[PDB]
């Protein structure tokens, strides 16, 4: 899974940055077809942003993507 993950996480990085954003967490929202609120997707964000950065690494990235339908 963790491979198709790393395919997954270059698609989701628009950016580039090498993470996960807020913004392009929204977006991953979508694209996994989860129905979350403006809020809610914020609120799923920081539960996923352990170490409270404002970002979801790569490591995170792999546990979000299990924790998130």
Same mark, same amino acid.
């Given at each position: 899974?963790?491979?198709?993950?790393?395919?997954?996480? /270059?698609?989701?990085?628009?950016? %580039?940055?090498?993470?996960?954003? /807020?913004?392009?967490?929204?977006?991953?929202? /979508?694209?996994?077809?989860?129905?979350?609120?403006?809020?809610? *997707?914020?609120?799923?964000? %920081?539960?996923?942003?352990?170490d409270?950065? %404002?970002?979801?690494?790569?490591?995170?990235?792999?546990?979000?993507?299990?924790? *998130?339908?």
């Amino acid at each position: 899974s963790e491979e198709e993950l790393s395919e997954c996480f /270059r698609i989701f990085d628009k950016d %580039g940055n090498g993470f996960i954003d /807020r913004e392009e967490f929204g977006d991953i929202i /979508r694209l996994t077809g989860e129905q979350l609120t403006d809020e809610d *997707v914020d609120e799923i964000f %920081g539960d996923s942003d352990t170490d409270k950065n %404002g970002r979801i690494d790569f490591d995170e990235f792999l546990k979000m993507m299990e924790n *998130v339908q």
